[PDB]
């Protein structure tokens, strides 16, 4: 519109590097916002401007490139190399008299935690299963990496060099782990050299066990056995449901409380309810969580069977205790 | 007087536990019917389900908070009832396994921010989500679903156009706004496989505030200049403004500024060996308007 422009926040992707490394960010409104080349808007007489500000909600200001440093390349910036003073949101604006299109992109420019390699809010994060492979990639280099050239990359582990067991392949931009173990755990920090400046991208990996073949485990009220546990009228009565969960996906567990047939939702009122899935313990992705049962005033209609479900996608169980 | 009927269906849908499932059902009648929801055939009394009428009065939405999936997997049923006759349908709701999920599931790649705006100030939320099929960005303000038939007031629909493998955008803009738009907003991304909800972001709207931006005016406007074929000139264009404007020169539809070191606020377009008669146009751009005044040379 020609009084407001219409504004796309900011965009999803967010770029985050250590001072003194080279970084172009280019304008997101051609690679999703809108179909059409830069030199295509370009031609039809829409014109490409830069503003900064320092915040999200504070003041926009126009831009005045050096060449050098800041440089404007077609619908993108160059920082050669990025200093501190250059975090902010920049701008991406495309408009002609009638129309107006923007966007924001966010950058930020940090120096790396005290004693590392690396700023512990400007991570990648990748999961892992011990036994199989896994392959971390130094991600958003393209800009850097000639098709005809090695990019002589290094990697450290804990910001520190360190001897790779052959399992560890080393090829390209990539590093592949055949088989990954609990050891394997760590930070993982890819660099590489550009035009004597240093750009480096690091990964945290968390490893956990296998995808279970086999359906939860339950500890308590065993199955096969019916346990009792009755009480007076006037106290009130809790019934707790252990189960052991395998690594099915990093998900919330499928632990749920039945009596006889009613999911304890319909003639609950205040009287009975679930226990809010408490997770006891977990390691590797595997966790043993409890959900109880509790009856605040007990009546004779809760008298019966109440049996705990577990369920994942191997199969389920159900065991039931009595009041 | 009327017997119910339906003006909104419920569709059959697939959510994810923990998320959230919405069922509409809008009926017109003289007098106007009433809605009512029957989970397996049986009335939905519970604190999970949360029955919202819209201000028309005309229609409800049954919105299940949390999915336990064997729990609420099942078929649930909209009877509008009037004084002179009772109409039904029918839907299924799938809650699936958090487990296992098809790998082209819409999934909120970015939801919504709580945003905080001036009144009678454009406010402009933004979503992005993805799938294997390209999803639908719908979006539900304070638990009942924002219609915008078509772009007629000023709750518009933004739609990003993207050409493939990017996410999609979807914005919802509010224009001029009033007090009541403020609470909670859901963006929902449906796809063929399942739908899913983004987190809530609520919208408040504050107090007036001073006018910071002012659109870009002409400072110096170039001035004309009957320097005969000898001699050259220099004409100086200055605009100003909040933000301050980028000024370019143009001769027609030439740009005659590079692109890349746009001045901001003054340009001199010096003119050296000039010979014949031209009409240059100064133009000062902003991120608020655009102007153009024009130098004429003889
Ligand atoms: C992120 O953290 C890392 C810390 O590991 C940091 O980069 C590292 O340390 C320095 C940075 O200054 C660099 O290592 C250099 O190595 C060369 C040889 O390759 C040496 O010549 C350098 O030593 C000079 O400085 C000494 C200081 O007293 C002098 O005594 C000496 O004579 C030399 O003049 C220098 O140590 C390199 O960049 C890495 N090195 C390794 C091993 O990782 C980085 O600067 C941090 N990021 C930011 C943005 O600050
Ligand atoms: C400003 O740019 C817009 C977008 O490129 C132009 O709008 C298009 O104009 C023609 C016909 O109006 C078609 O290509 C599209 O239907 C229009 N798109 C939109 C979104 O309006 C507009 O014509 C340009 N104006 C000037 C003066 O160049
Ligand atoms: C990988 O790096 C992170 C920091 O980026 C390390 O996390 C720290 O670990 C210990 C205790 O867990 C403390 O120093 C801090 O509480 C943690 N900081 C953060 C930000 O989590 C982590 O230990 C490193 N991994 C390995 C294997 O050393
Ligand atoms: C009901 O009793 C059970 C068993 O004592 C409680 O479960 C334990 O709660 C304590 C205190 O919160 C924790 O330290 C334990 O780890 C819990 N055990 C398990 C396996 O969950 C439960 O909190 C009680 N609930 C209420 C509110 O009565
Ligand atoms: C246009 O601007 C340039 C740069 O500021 C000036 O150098 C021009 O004026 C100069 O005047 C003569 C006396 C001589 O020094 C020569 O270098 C320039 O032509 C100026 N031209 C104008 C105002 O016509
Ligand atoms: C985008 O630009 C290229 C040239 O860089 C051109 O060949 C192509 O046709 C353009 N895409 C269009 C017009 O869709
Ligand atoms: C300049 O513009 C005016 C009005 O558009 C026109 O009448 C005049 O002929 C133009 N002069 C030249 C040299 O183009
Ligand atoms: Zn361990
Ligand atoms: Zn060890
Ligand atoms: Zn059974």
């Known amino acids: 519109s020609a009084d407001g422009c219409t504004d796309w926040s900011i965009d999803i992707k967010k770029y985050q590097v250590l001072v003194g490394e080279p970084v172009r960010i280019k304008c997101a409104l051609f690679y999703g916002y809108i179909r059409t080349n830069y030199s295509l808007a370009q031609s039809a007489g829409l014109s490409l401007m830069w503003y900064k500000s320092s915040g999200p909600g504070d003041f926009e200001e126009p831009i005045a490139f050096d060449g050098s440093r800041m440089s404007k390349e077609e619908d993108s910036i160059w920082f050669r190399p990025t200093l501190l003073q250059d975090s902010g949101l920049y701008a991406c604006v495309i408009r002609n008299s009638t129309y107006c299109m923007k966007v924001s992109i966010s950058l930020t420019v940090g120096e790396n935690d005290t004693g590392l390699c690396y700023n512990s809010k400007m991570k990648y994060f990748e999961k892992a299963e011990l036994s199989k492979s896994k392959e971390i990639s130094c991600r958003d280099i393209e800009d850097f990496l000639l098709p005809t050239r090695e990019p002589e990359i290094l990697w450290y582990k804990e910001c520190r060099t360190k001897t790779w067991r052959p399992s560890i392949v080393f090829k390209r931009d990539t590093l592949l782990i055949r088989e990954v173990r609990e050891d394997d755990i760590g930070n993982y920090t890819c660099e590489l050299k550009y035009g004597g400046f240093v750009v480096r991208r690091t990964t945290e990996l968390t490893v956990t066990a296998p995808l279970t073949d086999k359906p939860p485990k339950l500890l308590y009220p065993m199955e096969s056995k019916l346990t009792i546990q009755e009480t007076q009228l006037g106290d009130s009565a809790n019934l707790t449901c252990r189960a052991f969960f395998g690594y099915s996906g990093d998900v919330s567990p499928l632990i749920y409380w039945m009596k006889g047939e009613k999911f304890i939702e319909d003639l609950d009122e205040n009287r009975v309810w679930e226990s809010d899935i408490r997770i006891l313990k977990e390691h590797l992705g595997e966790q043993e969580v409890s959900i109880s049962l509790i009856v605040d005033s007990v009546e004779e209609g809760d008298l019966g069977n109440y049996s705990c479900y577990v369920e994942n996608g191997n199969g389920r169980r159900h065991a039931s205790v009595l009041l | ?298």
Not at chain 2, 149 to 156: A, C, F, L, P, V
Not at chain 2, 247 to 268: C, H, Q, S, Y
């Open chain 2, 1 to 298: 007087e009327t017997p119910p009927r339906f003006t909104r269906t419920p569709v059959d849908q697939t959510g994810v536990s923990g998320g959230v499932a919405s069922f509409i059902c809008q009926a017109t009648g003289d007098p106007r019917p009433k809605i009512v929801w029957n989970k397996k055939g049986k009335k939905v009394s519970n604190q999970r389900f949360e029955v919202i009428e819209f201000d028309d009065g005309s229609g409800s939405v049954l919105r299940i908070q949390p999915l336990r999936t064997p729990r609420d997997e099942a078929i649930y049923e909209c009877v509008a009832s009037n004084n002179v006759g009772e109409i039904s349908v029918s839907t299924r709701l799938t809650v699936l396994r958090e487990d296992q999920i098809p790998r082209g599931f819409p999934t909120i790649d970015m939801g919504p921010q709580l945003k905080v705006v001036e009144r009678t100030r454009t406010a402009t939320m933004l979503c992005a989500a993805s799938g294997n099929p390209d999803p639908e960005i719908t979006w539900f303000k304070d638990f009942l679903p924002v219609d915008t038939s078509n772009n007629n007031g000023r709750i518009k629909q933004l739609r990003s156009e993207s050409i493939g493998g990017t996410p999609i955008r979807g914005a919802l803009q509010i224009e001029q706004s009033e007090e009541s738009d403020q609470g909670k907003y859901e963006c929902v991304a449906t796809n063929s496989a399942g739908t899913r909800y983004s987190a809530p972001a609520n919208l408040y709207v504050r107090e007036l505030r001073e006018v910071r931006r002012v659109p870009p005016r002409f400072s110096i406007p170039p001035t004309n200049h009957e320097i005969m074929p000898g001699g050259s000139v220099n004409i100086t264009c200055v605009a100003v403004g909040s933000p301050m404007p980028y000024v370019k020169w143009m001769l027609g539809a030439e740009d005659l500024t590079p692109e890349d070191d746009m001045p901001i606020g003054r340009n001199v377009l010096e003119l050296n060996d000039v010979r014949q008669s031209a009409n240059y146009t100064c133009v000062a751009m902003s991120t608020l308007g655009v102007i153009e005044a024009i130098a004429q040379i003889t």
